[PDB]
Each structure stands twice: as structure tokens, then as C-alpha cells.
Amino acid sequence: GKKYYFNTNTAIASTGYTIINGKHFYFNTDGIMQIGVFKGPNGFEYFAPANTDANNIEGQAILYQNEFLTLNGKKYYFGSDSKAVTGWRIINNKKYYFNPNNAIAAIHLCTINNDKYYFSYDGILQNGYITIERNNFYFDANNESKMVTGVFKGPNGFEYFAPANTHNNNIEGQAIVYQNKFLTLNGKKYYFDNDSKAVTGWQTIDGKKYYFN
Amino acid sequence: DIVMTQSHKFMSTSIGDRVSITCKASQDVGTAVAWYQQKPGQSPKLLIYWASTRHTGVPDRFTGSGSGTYFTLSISNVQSEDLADYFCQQYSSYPLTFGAGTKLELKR
Amino acid sequence: EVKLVESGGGLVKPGGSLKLSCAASGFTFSNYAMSWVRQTPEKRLEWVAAINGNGAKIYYPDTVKDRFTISRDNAKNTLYLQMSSLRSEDTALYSCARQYGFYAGSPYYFDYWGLGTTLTVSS
Amino acid sequence: NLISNAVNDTINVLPTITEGIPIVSTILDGINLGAAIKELLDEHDPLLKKELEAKVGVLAINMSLSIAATVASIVGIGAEVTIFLLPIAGISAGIPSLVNNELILHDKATSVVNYFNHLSESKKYGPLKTEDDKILVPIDDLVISEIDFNNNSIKLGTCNILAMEGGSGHTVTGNIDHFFSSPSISSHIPSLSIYSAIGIETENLDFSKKIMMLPNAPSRVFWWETGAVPGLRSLENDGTRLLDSIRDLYPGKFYWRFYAFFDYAITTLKPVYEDTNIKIKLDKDTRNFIMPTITTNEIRNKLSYSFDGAGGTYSLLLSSYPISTNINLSKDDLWIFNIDNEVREISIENGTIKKGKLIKDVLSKIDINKNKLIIGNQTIDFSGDIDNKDRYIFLTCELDDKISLIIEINLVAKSYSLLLSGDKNYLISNLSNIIEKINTLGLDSKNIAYNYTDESNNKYFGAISKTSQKSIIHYKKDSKNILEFYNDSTLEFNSKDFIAEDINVFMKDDINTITGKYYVDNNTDKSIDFS
Numbered sequence: 001g002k003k004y005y006f007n008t009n010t011a012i013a014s015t016g017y018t019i020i021n022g023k024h025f026y027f028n029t030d031g032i033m034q035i036g037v038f039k040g041p042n043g044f045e046y047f048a049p050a051n052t053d054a055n056n057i058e059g060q061a062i063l064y065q066n067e068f069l070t071l072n073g074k075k076y077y078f079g080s081d082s083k084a085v086t087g088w089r090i091i092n093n094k095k096y097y098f099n100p101n102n103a104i105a106a107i108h109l110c111t112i113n114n115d116k117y118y119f120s121y122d123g124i125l126q127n128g129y130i131t132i133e134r135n136n137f138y139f140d141a142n143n144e145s146k147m148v149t150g151v152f153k154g155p156n157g158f159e160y161f162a163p164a165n166t167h168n169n170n171i172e173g174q175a176i177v178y179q180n181k182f183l184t185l186n187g188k189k190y191y192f193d194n195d196s197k198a199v200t201g202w203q204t205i206d207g208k209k210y211y212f213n
Numbered sequence: 214d215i216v217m218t219q220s221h222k223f224m225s226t227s228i229g230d231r232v233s234i235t236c237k238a239s240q241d242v243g244t245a246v247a248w249y250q251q252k253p254g255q256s257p258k259l260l261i262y263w264a265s266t267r268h269t270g271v272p273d274r275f276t277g278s279g280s281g282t283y284f285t286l287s288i289s290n291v292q293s294e295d296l297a298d299y300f301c302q303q304y305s306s307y308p309l310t311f312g313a314g315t316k317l318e319l320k321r
Numbered sequence: 322e323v324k325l326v327e328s329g330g331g332l333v334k335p336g337g338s339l340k341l342s343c344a345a346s347g348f349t350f351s352n353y354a355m356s357w358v359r360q361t362p363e364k365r366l367e368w369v370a371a372i373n374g375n376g377a378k379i380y381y382p383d384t385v386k387d388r389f390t391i392s393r394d395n396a397k398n399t400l401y402l403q404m405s406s407l408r409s410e411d412t413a414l415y416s417c418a419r420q421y422g423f424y425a426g427s428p429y430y431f432d433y434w435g436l437g438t439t440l441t442v443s444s
Numbered sequence: 445n446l447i448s449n450a451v452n453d454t455i456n457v458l459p460t461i462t463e464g465i466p467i468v469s470t471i472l473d474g475i476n477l478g479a480a481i482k483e484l485l486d487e488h489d490p491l492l493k494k495e496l497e498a499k500v501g502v503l504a505i506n507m508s509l510s511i512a513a514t515v516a517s518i519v520g521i522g523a524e525v526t527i528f529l530l531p532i533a534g535i536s537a538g539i540p541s542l543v544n545n546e547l548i549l550h551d552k553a554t555s556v557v558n559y560f561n562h563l564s565e566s567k568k569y570g571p572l573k574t575e576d577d578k579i580l581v582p583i584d585d586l587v588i589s590e591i592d593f594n595n596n597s598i599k600l601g602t603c604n605i606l607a608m609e610g611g612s613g614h615t616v617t618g619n620i621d622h623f624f625s626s627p628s629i630s631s632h633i634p635s636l637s638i639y640s641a642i643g644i645e646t647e648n649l650d651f652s653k654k655i656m657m658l659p660n661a662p663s664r665v666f667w668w669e670t671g672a673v674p675g676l677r678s679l680e681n682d683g684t685r686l687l688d689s690i691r692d693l694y695p696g697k698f699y700w701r702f703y704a705f706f707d708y709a710i711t712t713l714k715p716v717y718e719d720t721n722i723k724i725k726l727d728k729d730t731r732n733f734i735m736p737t738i739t740t741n742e743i744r745n746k747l748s749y750s751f752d753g754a755g756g757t758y759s760l761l762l763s764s765y766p767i768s769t770n771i772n773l774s775k776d777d778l779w780i781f782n783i784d785n786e787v788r789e790i791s792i793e794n795g796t797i798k799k800g801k802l803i804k805d806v807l808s809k810i811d812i813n814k815n816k817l818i819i820g821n822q823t824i825d826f827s828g829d830i831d832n833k834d835r836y837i838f839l840t841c842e843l844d845d846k847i848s849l850i851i852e853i854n855l856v857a858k859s860y861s862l863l864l865s866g867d868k869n870y871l872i873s874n875l876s877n878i879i880e881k882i883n884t885l886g887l888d889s890k891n892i893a894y895n896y897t898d899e900s901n902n903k904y905f906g907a908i909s910k911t912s913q914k915s916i917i918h919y920k921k922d923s924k925n926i927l928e929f930y931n932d933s934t935l936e937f938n939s940k941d942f943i944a945e946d947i948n949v950f951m952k953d954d955i956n957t958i959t960g961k962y963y964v965d966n967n968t969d970k971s972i973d974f975s
Contacts, residue, residue: 050289051231070280108552120675121554131671133551134712155672155706214382243681247430256416256434263681300366304428305681308382311366352643374643423567423689424641 003033024061044084075105095125116147136175158198225318236301245305251298323347343400343417354422373426412441467973495859503891516897522840536583561683586661593727604635626704667714674707764790773829808886
């Protein structure tokens with residue numbers, strides 16, 4: 001049940017990328033032929049099963065362009081040149097990120113060039129107020145949909161998203177409890193309440209009146 | 214309400230070929246499409262459910278694929294017993310709509 | 322083991338009424354959702370009605386509301402379909418099918434199908 | 445009482461060797477044990493007589509076809525159950541993590557959806573999945589009774605979830621409800637069951653296959669939270685239909701994904717694991733069981749097995765991780781316990797169970813009582829009929845791929861005895877390694893019996909002494925008696941033709957003794973006994 005190829009002049013089982021009679025085949029390091037998307041000399045190509053397109057055989061790299069692919073629940077996108085797209089990509093005005101190691105769309109929190117991003121269960125980029133593992137985070141849409149720290153609008157008013165190790169062995173971006181204290185970020189001051197939410201109006205603190213927009 | 218159109222009403226093939234029946238939906242159904250096989254003078258038998266996996270006892274030649282509005286049912290090796298009707302139907306909404314029909318005939 | 326036998330065949334005047342039946346054995350009843358289908362010869366298959374496990378919610382399309390109905394009796398393992406106002410367009414092979422429901426009655430595929438009741442209406 | 449039994453009983457104190465004409469064997473350390481005790485042992489096999497002869501050292505082997513067939517069935521069941529293997533419990537659903545002492549199970553929305561997708565497989569494959577020759581429970585699906593052996597039905601426990609309080613304004617559009625005030629999870633307003641939403645076939649099941657894996661069945665309540673996670677709205681075409689079934693069955697009391705002001709979904713899933721006891725009712729047949737391996741102590745300690753005792757032939761593969769077990773008994777019962785997972789070092793490599801070499805002195809201390817047997821790290825509780833003096837409990841372990849060690853334990857007499865099996869020539873070749881493995885196990889029985897039933901139904905009977913490694917094997921081939929004696933590698937004696945009747949073989953310490961009846965010059969009237 002395992003297909004192999006041996007060379008006609010040396011009888012050696014090929015264990016990598018192999019070009020046979022003008023067609024391309026990929027093999028595992030034990031010589032067993034495999035079906036999937038693998039890295040070759042040109043790049044990433046799809047090795048389809050037999051007769052998917054243009055009467056091919058098993059293991060042949062085929063012309064697969066401008067459509068998605070899903071082997072084990074994964075997401076592979078192939079460009080016009082029948083090669084898998086890596087890096088950032090806009091597909092139907094939605095943003096997906098495929099790794100340079102293999103063309104896998106990210107599905108959760110991930111570190112992309114020393115920055116944290118959140119993708120949904122099918123790889124679409126998401127914005128707004130998002131929780132991750134019972135801790136409330138924020139991903140600002142105004143600056144390339146990345147993770148931020150500061151004060152932003154949540155579901156029950158504004159909350160403070162602290163940096164790393166700010167209050168009670170904190171983590172970065174986490175909404176924290178901050179009860180009746182003062183803060184400033186870039187010359188702009190904020191005042192919070194008993195329920196750790198920032199307040200807005202003609203508020204008086206220690207007998208001195210303040211106003212917030 | 215929802216309608217669902219199949220491509221070819223009649224098609225023919227020989228033993229040993231591969232046949233890809235294509236079904237198209239009016240709107241998005243999201244992998245909620247099933248595949249049947251009605252023998253003449255017999256009840257239909259379900260083959261593919263959730264548009265990707267096969268029923269218990271269905272042979273390995275019946276492979277289904279598709280997500281969105283384009284669903285293909287493929288047979289890896291046509292035999293004598295693999296010559297019957299083939300139906301598609303969405304189940305993403307209460308007015309269930311079935312396919313028109315596709316009879317797999319023998320090329321003689 | 323699993324069988325679905327149905328006995329409602331006949332010929333009726335247009336504008337009349339008829340009642341179908343569908344017995345079941347091999348599997349426990351009131352656990353699986355049932356439905357009726359209408360296999361026309363000239364046209365495609367037409368799902369006509371469906372009911373849930375305990376007979377709570379019944380679903381019809383626009384051409385079936387206030388025309389047909391399903392009553393289910395769980396004690397005798399039967400499934401009915403009472404018809405009315407057959408306007409010479411219901412000549413089809415009525416079949417009894419078993420859905421993969423859980424409780425509510427939701428759109429699904431069918432596990433097993435009935436053999437068919439050849440019902441036609443004419444003058 | 446002593447007055448009554450002394451008047452009733454008569455004692456002869458005059459020095460006589462024989463009175464009831466046996467073939468007497470007064471050579472063994474000057475003891476008059478010859479046949480005046482051994483006829484009572486060989487006629488009806490008393491358990492106290494066997495236990496009190498074990499303190500002298502006498503192992504009288506049994507050549508009865510019922511014992512040989514029982515040993516053959518025991519070694520066949522043990523061989524099959526040892527041959528096929530199975531993974532650990534919570535691979536498909538379970539293995540929860542202990543985070544802040546609350547046992548969180550699933551961390552995210554798609555993991556919760558995949559858990560309910562796995563639980564929806566009881567509608568597809570039934571409440572008991574089938575391999576080629578084994579009935580298997582689904583993972584994290586609790587069944588509480590399994591009276592299915594008698595009247596073909598099982599019963600389900602509780603797997604309910606916490607309810608929900610009221611919301612302000614509820615409208616449904618596109619199968620996603622848009623709230624105006626997000627409702628809250630209440631620990632009061634009692635829980636909502638899931639098994640009322642799954643319609644499980646539980647009254648007509650098929651048990652053609654006689655090997656069953658016992659369930660991982662504690663009753664639990666799923667505490668759960670709700671986060672934002674605004675990335676899923678097209679996930680509804682999945683096994684979310686079970687969640688929608690719970691939503692529609694309990695109207696206003698459960699909502700798994702809503703749109704109050706933001707997107708919301710189930711995020712976590714925290715079980716409770718209250719106590720559950722499973723009352724398995726057995727029947728006449730020969731059902732075999734495999735106890736599951738659970739790697740979490742907080743789920744492992746909330747389980748108990750309560751096997752009934754109808755007149756069959758049952759086996760149970762004990763796992764390395766102990767489960768509390770209660771055994772009900774009756775008159776006719778044959779209980780088998782496979783301790784192969786107990787006498788080997790157990791490691792988890794890729795989710796399965798791989799057995800190590802051996803464990804030193806794991807069976808040196810066998811606490812045998814009238815109603816409780818403790819072996820290794822497991823306690824087995826016996827009840828119902830704990831006063832029968834004609835019932836044995838068998839312990840099986842595979843010392844090799846061919847030779848099996850069977851320990852014959854009687855509860856009320858508090859005795860254990862050793863037997864062997866496998867091919868005769870292989871056992872003679874590997875006898876040194878077999879006794880080395882037994883000494884590694886730590887058993888102190890000096891004489892080991894050996895009953896075998898080879899292919900084409902020819903029986904072997906044996907007796908192996910552990911000290912100095914002497915063996916006697918007597919077997920019948922081609923309608924004649926063959927008798928072999930081994931000094932552990934060499935055939936020191938061999939009678940290919942052995943004309944004798946009523947052959948009985950026993951050892952004392954290292955002294956083999958063979959007795960019977962001989963006819964002088966093939967004359968029936970010239971009958972001479974011999975030892």
C-alpha cells in the first residue's frame with residue numbers, strides 16, 4: 001500500500017523532491033510517497049491525488065490556482081502561479097496570515113514579527129475587545145489590527161489595559177482592577193472608579209473639579 | 214425558499230473512469246450538503262454527509278468535497294454497481310431543497 | 322434489522338382527503354425525527370413535512386401550511402400524514418424517512434428511507 | 445461440644461499402617477501420609493485439606509478433565525485480553541487540567557464545541573461503540589447501570605449543566621439571538637440535562653461481542669463561563685446543533701452564543717465529579733471486561749464497580765490505576781482477574797499503555813480474607829455469598845508470550861496455589877527464566893503445578909519444584925502413557941510405554957512420587973499396586 005520510486009540507473013529510493021519524466025513528485029525521508037503540500041526548490045506546491053485535474057496520477061504536483069485548501073482542517077491558499085501564498089494576504093477583503101515555515105493560517109494568538117495578533121477559528125483577522133483564556137485583552141483596529149496597551153472602550157465602559165507586571169503578577173494588555181487611583185499615558189490623565197472603570201463628566205476628586213470627554 | 218441546481222441531468226462513462234458530479238446552491242450553505250444514490254426500484258442510500266465524510270458501509274471510492282456554493286462528488290473507479298442516480302440536498306434551512314438528478318450511465 | 326413499512330395506497334377524487342401510515346421497528350421510537358417526502362416522476366424530490374422526536378414542533382413550506390398535517394403516535398410506532406385538498410399535483414411516490422435529529426427538529430440528512438407508497442389523483 | 449464429638453467419634457491408637465487397603469507411602473520423612481489422607485484429597489478435593497497439606501509440602505496434581513478445561517479457558521481468555529491493547533481514558537474528550545484548584549476541562553469556544561461534537565456521536569454510533577471484536581464505551585459518556593446482560597437495556601447518569609437567569613429583550617435572527625441585556629449563569633435555579641437532548645437508544649442493544657471496556661462514568665455538573673471571542677458566527681454548521689437542541693429544549697434557561705452588545709460564546713467548562721457507583725448486572729454467558737485506565741486522581745477516586753454474580757464465567761483486566769470494585773457472588777461462579785497491568789511497570793508513550801519488565805515483590809504479600817482480596821495496590825470487595833467453601837478465584841499473569849502463570853485463590857480457606865501453562869518443550873527450555881521471573885514476583889509457593897491443553901485436544905499434566913528445579917510431566921499420546929522427568933535441562937527419565945491405571949503424581953519437598961496399579965503378565969486378576 002506504500003508507493004515508492006527507485007532510480008532506473010542506481011536503484012535508490014528517492015527521499016525528497018524528485019522530477020520524473022517532466023512531472024514533480026515528493027517523498028518522505030523513508031521513501032514513502034505522500035499526499036499534501038510540501039516545500040520544493042521553487043516553493044510550496046500541492047501534490048494532488050490522481051485525476052483531480054488534467055488526468056494526473058497520484059503524487060503529481062498540479063495546477064491549483066486562486067482557491068483554498070483544507071487537508072486536516074488547515075487553510076492553504078494558492079496564488080495565480082500555482083504556489084502557496086505565505087505572509088500577509090488579503091482574500092475577499094479579509095486578512096489571513098500564512099507562516100513562512102508552512103502555508104498554515106493562524107487560528108489563535110500568535111507572535112508575528114515581535115507583535116501579537118488574534119485570528120478567528122478559520123483564520124480571519126479580528127478586532128475589538130477580545131478575551132483570551134478568561135482574561136480580557138484588546139486589539140486596536142486603528143494600527144494594523146495589533147495588540148495594544150492603554151485605556152479603551154469595553155463592554156461596561158473604559159478599562160485599563162496594563163503593560164507587563166503592573167499589578168498582581170500581571171500580563172501585558174490584560175484588563176486589570178484599578179480602584180480610585182490616577183494614571184497618565186502620553187500627557188493625558190484618566191481617573192477610575194470603585195468598579196475599576198474610567199469615569200466621564202464633571203467629577204470632583206478631593207474637592208477639585210475635573211472634566212473628561 | 215432556497216433553490217439548488219445540479220449541473221447535468223444525464224451523463225455516461227465507462228468502467229474504470231472517474232466521474233465528478235457537481236451541485237450548485239443559490240446561497241451559502243456551509244458544508245451542510247448530503248449525497249445519495251437511488252437504485253432503480255429501490256430506496257435511496259445516503260453516501261456523504263457534512264459534504265466531506267462517508268457513511269458506514271459506503272465504499273472508499275466515493276469521495277466528496279466542497280465548501281460554500283460548489284460541491285463535487287467523485288468516484289475513483291466506476292463499476293457495474295456504481296451506476297445509479299445521485300442527489301444533492303442542503304440542510305442549512307427548514308425548506309429542504311434536493312438536487313435535480315444525475316443518472317450515471319454506461320458507455321457502450 | 323431497521324425497517325420502515327408504509328401502507329396508504331389508493332386513488333381518490335381531487336379535493337378529497339386521505340391518511341397515510343408508516344410503521345417502524347428495529348430501533349426505539351420517539352428518539353429520531355421523522356419526515357415525509359414526495360418523489361415526483363417528472364420533477365425532483367420534494368420534502369413536504371417533518372416532525373421532531375416528541376411531536377412538539379412541525380415544519381411546513383408555503384404550499385403545505387393549512388393543507389397537510391403530521392400526527393405521531395409513539396405507543397404503536399406509527400407515523401401518519403393526513404392530506405386534504407389534493408389539486409391534481411400530488412401524484413408522487415410518498416416515502417417515510419428517518420432524520421438524525423436530537424430533540425428540536427432541525428434540517429438534516431436521512432439515514433434510512435421507506436420503499437414508497439404510489440399515490441396518484443385524477444378523474 | 446467436645447463431650448459430644450468425643451462420644452460421637454472413635455479414634456484408633458494402635459499402630460497400624462493400613463486398614464482401608466490403600467497403597468501406602470510411609471517413606472517421606474517417616475510420615476504416614478501415604479494415601480490414607482491422599483484418597484480423601486483425590487476423591488473430593490477439600491480446600492482445608494489442600495491448605496493444610498501445603499504446610500507439609502504436598503502438591504497432588506489434578507488430572508480431571510473439568511480442571512483441564514477450566515485452565516484452558518482461563519489461559520485463552522487471558523491470552524486474548526493481553527494480546528489486544530487500548531489507550532488511556534480521556535484522549536478524545538478528557539484529561540482536564542488543574543488550574544487554581546477548579547479542574548478546568550476545555551479552555552476555548554472551539555474546544556467546547558468539539559467536546560459537544562464528540563458527545564453527539566452517541567446518536568450516531570449508539571451508546572457503545574464497536575471495534576472488530578470489542579464493545580467500547582464513548583469517552584466521557586457515563587452509564588450507570590448496564591443491566592443489558594439480562595434484559596438488554598442500559599441506564600444513563602447525570603451530565604447536566606448550570607442554567608441561566610433572565611435576559612431583557614430576546615429576538616432571534618439567522619439562528620443567532622440578539623439580546624439587549626446579557627443573562628447570567630446562576631448556581632441556583634437547578635441544572636439542565638444534556639442527555640434529555642441527546643436521544644440515546646438505551647432499551648434494545650446488541651451484545652454479540654463478549655469483551656467490554658468499562659466506562660469512565662462519574663456524575664458531574666459542568667460549570668461554565670462566557671467570554672467575548674468575536675470570531676465565530678458561521679460555526680453553526682457543526683456539532684453545535686446539540687447546543688441548539690439544549691437551547692430549544694430549555695427555553696430561556698440556556699443560551700450558548702448570543703449578541704447582547706458584543707459577540708459572546710461559551711469559553712470554559714468546569715466539571716464537578718460527584719460520586720457514582722455502577723451496578724453491573726451479569727448473566728449466564730461468559731462476558732469479559734477490561735477496566736479503563738484514568739490518569740487523573742480526582743476523577744479516578746469518584747468511581748466504583750458493583751458486578752453482580754449470576755452463574756457464568758467472568759474476567760476482569762485490572763488496570764495499574766486502581767478503581768474501587770465490589771463483587772457479588774452466588775453458588776456457581778468463576779471469577780478471573782488479569783493482573784498483567786499490575787505486575788508490570790506501566791508507562792504512557794503516545795496515549796496507549798506500554799508494559800515494562802516486572803515489579804519486584806508486588807505479589808509477596810497477598811492479603812486474602814473471607815470477603816476482601818488485596819493484591820498490589822488494589823482492593824477487591826466480595827459480598828453476597830462469602831461463605832461458600834467450593835469456589836475459587838483465579839489470578840492470571842503472562843510471564844512470557846507462551847507461558848502463563850495462574851494463581852488459584854480460595855477466599856474462605858485463605859490459600860493460594862500456582863499453576864503453569866504453555867508448550868512443554870518451551871517450558872523445559874525456559875524453566876530457569878520462568879522460576880527467575882516468579883522469584884522476581886516474590887511468590888513463596890515451593891511446588892508449581894502445570895496443566896496444559898495443546899492443539900487437537902491432548903492434555904499435559906505437570907509438577908515443577910522451585911528448589912533445585914525438578915519436573916515431572918505425564919501425558920497420554922497415541923493411547924499410551926508417556927512419563928518424563930527433567931533436571932531442568934535434561935530428560936533424566938523417559939518411559940514411552942507406562943502400563944498403569946489410576947496414575948497419581950505428587951511431590952513432597954523434592955521427592956516425586958508416582959502411584960497407580962499394575963497387572964502381572966497382563967492378567968486382570970493379578971492386580972498389584974505400587975508407589
